[PDB]
Amino acid sequence: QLAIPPRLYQICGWFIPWLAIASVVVLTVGWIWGFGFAPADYQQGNSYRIIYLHVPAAIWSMGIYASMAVAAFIGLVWQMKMANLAVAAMAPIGAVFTFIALVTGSAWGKPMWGTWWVWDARLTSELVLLFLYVGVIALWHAFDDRRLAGRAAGILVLIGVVNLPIIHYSVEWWNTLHQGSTRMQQSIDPAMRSPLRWSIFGFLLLSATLTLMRMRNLILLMEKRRPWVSE
Amino acid sequence: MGMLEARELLCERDERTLFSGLSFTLNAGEWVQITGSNGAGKTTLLRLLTGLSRPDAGEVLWQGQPLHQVRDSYHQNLLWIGHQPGIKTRLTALENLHFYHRDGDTAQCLEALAQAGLAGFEDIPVNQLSAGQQRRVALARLWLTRATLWILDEPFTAIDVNGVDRLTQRMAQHTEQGGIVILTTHQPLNVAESKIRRISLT
Amino acid sequence: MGMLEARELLCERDERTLFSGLSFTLNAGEWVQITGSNGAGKTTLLRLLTGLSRPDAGEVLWQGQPLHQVRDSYHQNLLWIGHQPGIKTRLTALENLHFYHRDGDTAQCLEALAQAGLAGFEDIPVNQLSAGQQRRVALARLWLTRATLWILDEPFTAIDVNGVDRLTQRMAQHTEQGGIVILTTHQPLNVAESKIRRISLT
Amino acid sequence: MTPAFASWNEFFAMGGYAFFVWLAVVMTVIPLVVLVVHSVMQHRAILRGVAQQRA
Amino acid sequence: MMFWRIFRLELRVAFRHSAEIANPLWFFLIVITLFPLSIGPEPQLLARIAPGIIWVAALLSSLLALERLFRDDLQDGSLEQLMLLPLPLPAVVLAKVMAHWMVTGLPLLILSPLVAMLLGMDVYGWQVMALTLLLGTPTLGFLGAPGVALTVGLKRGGVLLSILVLPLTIPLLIFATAAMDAASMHLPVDGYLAILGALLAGTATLSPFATAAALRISIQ
Amino acid sequence: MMFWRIFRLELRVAFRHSAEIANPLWFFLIVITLFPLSIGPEPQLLARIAPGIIWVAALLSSLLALERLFRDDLQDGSLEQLMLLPLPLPAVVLAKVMAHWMVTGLPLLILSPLVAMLLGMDVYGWQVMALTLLLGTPTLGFLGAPGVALTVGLKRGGVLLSILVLPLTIPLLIFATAAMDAASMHLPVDGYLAILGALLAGTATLSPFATAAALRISIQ
Numbered sequence A: 001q002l003a004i005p006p007r008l009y010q011i012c013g014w015f016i017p018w019l020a021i022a023s024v025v026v027l028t029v030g031w032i033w034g035f036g037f038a039p040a041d042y043q044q045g046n047s048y049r050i051i052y053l054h055v056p057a058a059i060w061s062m063g064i065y066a067s068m069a070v071a072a073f074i075g076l077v078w079q080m081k082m083a084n085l086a087v088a089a090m091a092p093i094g095a096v097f098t099f100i101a102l103v104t105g106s107a108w109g110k111p112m113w114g115t116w117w118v119w120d121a122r123l124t125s126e127l128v129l130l131f132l133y134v135g136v137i138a139l140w141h142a143f144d145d146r147r148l149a150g151r152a153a154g155i156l157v158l159i160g161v162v163n164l165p166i167i168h169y170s171v172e173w174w175n176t177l178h179q180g181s182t183r184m185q186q187s188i189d190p191a192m193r194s195p196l197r198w199s200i201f202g203f204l205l206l207s208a209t210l211t212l213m214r215m216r217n218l219i220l221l222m223e224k225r226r227p228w229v230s231e
Numbered sequence B, C: 001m002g003m004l005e006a007r008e009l010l011c012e013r014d015e016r017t018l019f020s021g022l023s024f025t026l027n028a029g030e031w032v033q034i035t036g037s038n039g040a041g042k043t044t045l046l047r048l049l050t051g052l053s054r055p056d057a058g059e060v061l062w063q064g065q066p067l068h069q070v071r072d073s074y075h076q077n078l079l080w081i082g083h084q085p086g087i088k089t090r091l092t093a094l095e096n097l098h099f100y101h102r103d104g105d106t107a108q109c110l111e112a113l114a115q116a117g118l119a120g121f122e123d124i125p126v127n128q129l130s131a132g133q134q135r136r137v138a139l140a141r142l143w144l145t146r147a148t149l150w151i152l153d154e155p156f157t158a159i160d161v162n163g164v165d166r167l168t169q170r171m172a173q174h175t176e177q178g179g180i181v182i183l184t185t186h187q188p189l190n191v192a193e194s195k196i197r198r199i200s201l202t
Numbered sequence D: 001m002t003p004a005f006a007s008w009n010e011f012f013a014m015g016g017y018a019f020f021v022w023l024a025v026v027m028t029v030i031p032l033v034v035l036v037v038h039s040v041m042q043h044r045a046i047l048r049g050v051a052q053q054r055a
Numbered sequence E, F: 001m002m003f004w005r006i007f008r009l010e011l012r013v014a015f016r017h018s019a020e021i022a023n024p025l026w027f028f029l030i031v032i033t034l035f036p037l038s039i040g041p042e043p044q045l046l047a048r049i050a051p052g053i054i055w056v057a058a059l060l061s062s063l064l065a066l067e068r069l070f071r072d073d074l075q076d077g078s079l080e081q082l083m084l085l086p087l088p089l090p091a092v093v094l095a096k097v098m099a100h101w102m103v104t105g106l107p108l109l110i111l112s113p114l115v116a117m118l119l120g121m122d123v124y125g126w127q128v129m130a131l132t133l134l135l136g137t138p139t140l141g142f143l144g145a146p147g148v149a150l151t152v153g154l155k156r157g158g159v160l161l162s163i164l165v166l167p168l169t170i171p172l173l174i175f176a177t178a179a180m181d182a183a184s185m186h187l188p189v190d191g192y193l194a195i196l197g198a199l200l201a202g203t204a205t206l207s208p209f210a211t212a213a214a215l216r217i218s219i220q
C-alpha cells in the first residue's frame, strides 16, 4: 500500500533528523578510526589515508546514479511524479560526489604522477559520469514547467544509464590501447578495511539525508500553491 | 452512437482547475463548439480529444476504446488544425497539401486549394504568403480529407469574411453526411443555434 | 502639414500589383482602418507605414520629413503590433512587458496587464499563456505607451468577446484625445461608422 | 586506544604529504557543507515565500 | 503519412534550408584544415593526430547540424505526426533521422576522398575512414535524436544540446579513432568495424523509441 | 531607448536560472575532454595541439550562439527594435553582440586557468591564450553577425550566403592559433597581438553598421 500524497513531505521530515544524526556519528567514527588511528601502507605512506575520503565518494557517485536510474524507471512506466522528483533530488548530490572523487583522486595521484591531471581510465570514467550528472541537472533546470522536467530528466537518466556500461568499457579499453593497465594493483589491508567500510556507510547515510532534504524542498517547490502548505 | 466519449476528464493546471468531471458523447452528425474565454481550457480539452496530451484524470474513448489502444485506427478518422497551422513555411502551398493526401493528389490538391481560396498561389512558398493565406493552406485539407472527425481550434484566426463563409459552409455539409466537427471559435458562427451543440467547461 | 502621410505609394509582389498611387494624409484624432480582402497588401502597407519596408515607388512622411530622415522622433511616438506580437515567449508576462515600457515602474506594468485582462498571469511564462493571453501581453502596451500613433495588424486575432470590447474602447478614447490608430481587422468593429475612416487599396 | 601517530599535529597533520592530504580533506568537506547549507537555506527561503505569497 | 513520404518531405525541407546544412560542412573543413596549418612540415606528427581531429570534426559538425532535426516542427507541425499519420511515432522518428543523415552524414562520406588527399593518407586509410564514417555517422544521428527531442521545447540552440548527447558519443569516437589509427599501421580492422556495426545496430533500435517518448514529453 | 536594457534582456533570455550560468563552462569542459579521447592521453602532444583545441571550441561556441542571436527574433520580435527603440539599429546590434560574447567569450576566459593545465600549458602559454581569447573571441561575434543576419532571415537564400559566416573567420583563427603556437616556443607574440587588436578595433566599428544594413535588407 503506497499512499504517495503530499504526506511524503511529512515522512521525509520524520526521517531527516535521525538519519542526519546517524550519518554524522558514523562519519565521525569512520574518520577518527581512519585519518589518525589506522596504520599507513608501505608505498604511499600517509597519502594512503585518502581511501576513507576518496573511495566512498567514488562508490556512491555510481550508487546515486544507479538509484537515479531506478527512480527514473519507476517514474516512467508507472507514471509517478515523486519518482521523477527523486531524480532531481539526487542529481546534485551525485554530481558533488563525482566532483569529490575527481578532486581527491587527483590530489592523491599527484605525488606519484607528478602532475595534478592524468588522462587515465579512472579519471576519464568519473569525468564522463560527472558530464552525465551535469547534463541531467541542466535538463531539469531548463524547463519552466515542472512535472515535465523529471519526465525529460528521467528519460535522459535512462538513456545515460543504458550507455554508461558502454562508455565505461570503452574508456577502460581505450586506456589499455595506450598504456596497458592500472598503477600496480588493488589492496586494502585488514587494518585499513574496517574504517573504509565505516566511511562508505557514512557517505551512504549522508547521501540519504541529503536526498530526503532535497526531496522535501522539491515537494514544496512543486506544491507551493496547494492549500496543504497553509503552514 | 458514441464516436467519441469523454469520461470524467479533469485538468488542474497550477492552482486553476480548467474543468472537472467532463463527460460528453458525440455521435455522427454533431457540430459541437467548445465555449469559454481566453483562459478557459479550450485548447487543452481539444488536445486531450486528439490524444496529444493525456488527461490528469479520466480518458477519451474513440468508438468505445481508449485512444492509446486504438491509436492506429483513430488517426485514420481525425483532422486537427490547431493554433499552429502545421505546414512548412519554406515549402509551397501545393507541396504542403501534397503531403496530407493519400492518393490521386497533384490534381485534387489543386482543386482543394481552389476551394480554400488559393487559386494562383499554389506554387508560392508559404512564408511568402499572407497571414490569412497561410491559414488557408492548412484549411484546404477540409476539402481533401475523408476523415469523419474534424477537431478545429479557431479556424477563422485570420480568414476574411468570404473565407469564413466558405469554411462555415464546408463544415456544414460534412456534418450533414454524418461527420463530426469539434470547434472552438471566438467569431460567432453564422448558423442557426439549433445546428451547434454548445458545451462549456463546467 | 499633418502627421503620417503617404505620397503615391506603389508596391507589387510577384506579378500582381497590391496598390498604386496611395496618397492619404492622417491628422490628429483620426481612427482609420485599412480595408481589404485576405491576400491584399494590408500588412505590406502597414510595414511601409512603420518604415520597416521601403516602398517600391513612393514615400511616407512623418511631420513632413521622410521616415528614414528622422527615424528617431518617429519611433519615439509610434506603437506597431503586427501579426507576430513581438514578445519573448520564455519571459513572463511582466518582464516581457517591463522591457517595452519607458521605465518599467512595475506599478504601471501590473496595472496595464490587469487592464488588458491578464490579471493573475503576470509571473507565468508567456509560452504557458494560451493563445490570446499571449496576444494580450503585446496588447497590454496599449495602456502604457505615450505614443501618438498606433499601428495594429489584426489586434483581435485570438481575443474573446470581452477583450475585443475592451480593446475597442481603449482605441476609442486614444483617438479622442489626439491619437491616431491605423487598423486592419477582418472582424467588423463594434463602433459607429462615422468614427472610422476606411481607406482601400486602389 | 592506540593512535597511528607518536604525538600531536607536530607528528599528526603532516605525514610528509600534509598538503595533499589536507587539500583533499578541505576540498571534500567544503562541497558537502555547501550542499547541507544550501538545502537548509533553500528550505527556509521556500517557507518564507509561502508566507510571502500570503499577502 | 507514409514512411518514405515523411523521408522525402524532410529531405525536401532540408534542401530548401540551404546555408544551414552547409555550415556544418564548412565547420568540418575548417577544423580538419586548422590543425595541419598549425603543425608545420611534420608528416609523422600529422599522421598521429589525423584520425582524432577527423572524428572530432565529424562529431562537432554533427552537433552543429543536430539543431534543425526537430527545431522547425514544434513551432508549426511537430504534431500532425504524433496526432495523425497512423504510422507509429518511432517510425516517423526513424524516417526523420534517415533524412537528416542524408544531408548531414552523407556529405562527410562524399567529402572523405578529398580529406584523405588533404591529410595525405593512403587508399587503405581512406577505405577504413569511409567505412568508419558510414557506420559512425548514423550512430551519431541516432544518439543525438533523443537529446534534440528532449531540448526541442527549450529551443536553446546552444550549449545545452552539446552536453546531453556529446558524452554519449564517446565510445563511438574511441572505437572509430582506434579503427582509423590501426589502419595507419596497415593492420586488420575487422574487429573495430564489427564493434562499430554493433553500436549502430544497438543505437538504431532503441533511439527511435527513446526519441518518440521524448517527443511525447515535449509536446505536452 | 536605453541600450543597456537590450543588453540585459539578451542576457536574461540566455540564463533563466542561476544554475544555467555554468552550462557554457560544462560545454567547454566536454569539448576539451573530447580531444584526449581521440588523439590520445600523452600530455606533450596535447600541448602542441592545444591552440587548435581551444580555438575550435571557441568557434563552435560562437557558431552555436550566433544562431540564437537573430533567428529566434524573426518569428516574434526582430522588429520592435528596427521599428521601435529610438536608439539606432547599430546600437541594438552592438548590445546583442556583447551579450553573445558574454555568454560565449567570458566562459572560455573564466575557465582558461583550468583548461591551461588539462592540456599542459605553462604560465606564458596561458597568458597568451587569455590575451588572444580576450582580443579574438569578441570579434567572433562581430564579423559573424552580418552573415548570420542574412542567412537566418533571408528567404530563398542560396549556399553562397554561408560564405559570409564561417570562412570569414579563417584569418582570425589562423592569426590567433599562430599567436598561441609562437607562445608555445616562448617567442615574442607582440606582433600577433597587434593584428588581433587591429581586427577587434576595426571589426567592432564596422560590424554593427554592416549588421544593421543586413537586417534592413533582410526584413524587406
Ligand code: HEM
Binding pocket: A055, A058, A059, A101, A102, A104, A105, A106, A108, A109, A122, A123, A124, A126, A127, A186, A187
Ligand atoms: C585520479 C582520479 C581517480 C578517480 C576518478 C578514481 C575513481 C574511482 C572509482 C570510480 C572507484 C570505484 C571502484 C571501482 O571503480 O572499481 C575507485 C575506487 C578506488 N580507488 Fe580510485 N580513482 C582515482 C584515483 C585513484 C588513485 C590515484 C588511487 C591510488 C591508490 C586510487 C585508489 C582506489 C582504490 C584502492 C579503490 C578501491 C576500489 C574498490 O575496492 O572497489 N584511486 N576509484
Ligand SMILES: Nc1ncnc2c1ncn2[C@@H]1O[C@H](COP(=O)(O)OP(=O)(O)OP(=O)(O)O)[C@@H](O)[C@H]1O
Binding pocket: A145, B013, B018, B036, B037, B038, B039, B040, B041, B042, B043, B044, B045, C127, C128, C129, C130, C131, C132, C133, C158, C159, E220
Ligand atoms: N504549457 C501550457 N500550454 C498552454 N496552457 C497552459 C500551459 N501550462 C498551463 N497552462 C494554462 O492552462 C490553460 C489552458 O487554456 P487554453 O489554452 O485552453 O485557452 P484557450 O481557450 O485556448 O485560449 P484562446 O481562446 O486564447 O485560444 C491556460 O489558461 C494556461 O494558463
Ligand SMILES: Nc1ncnc2c1ncn2[C@@H]1O[C@H](COP(=O)(O)OP(=O)(O)OP(=O)(O)O)[C@@H](O)[C@H]1O
Binding pocket: B127, B128, B129, B130, B131, B132, B133, B158, B159, C013, C014, C018, C036, C037, C038, C039, C040, C041, C042, C043, C044, C045
Ligand atoms: N514575405 C512576405 N510576407 C507576406 N506576404 C508576402 C511576402 N512576400 C510577398 N508577399 C505577397 O504580398 C502580398 C501582400 O500580402 P499581405 O501580407 O499584405 O496580406 P494581408 O492583407 O496582411 O493578409 P491578412 O489580412 O491575412 O494578414 C501577398 O499576396 C503575398 O503573396
Ligand SMILES: [Mg+2]
Binding pocket: B042, B043, B083, B153, C130, C131
Ligand atoms: Mg486556444
Ligand SMILES: [Mg+2]
Binding pocket: B130, B131, B132, C042, C043, C044, C083, C153
Ligand atoms: Mg496581414
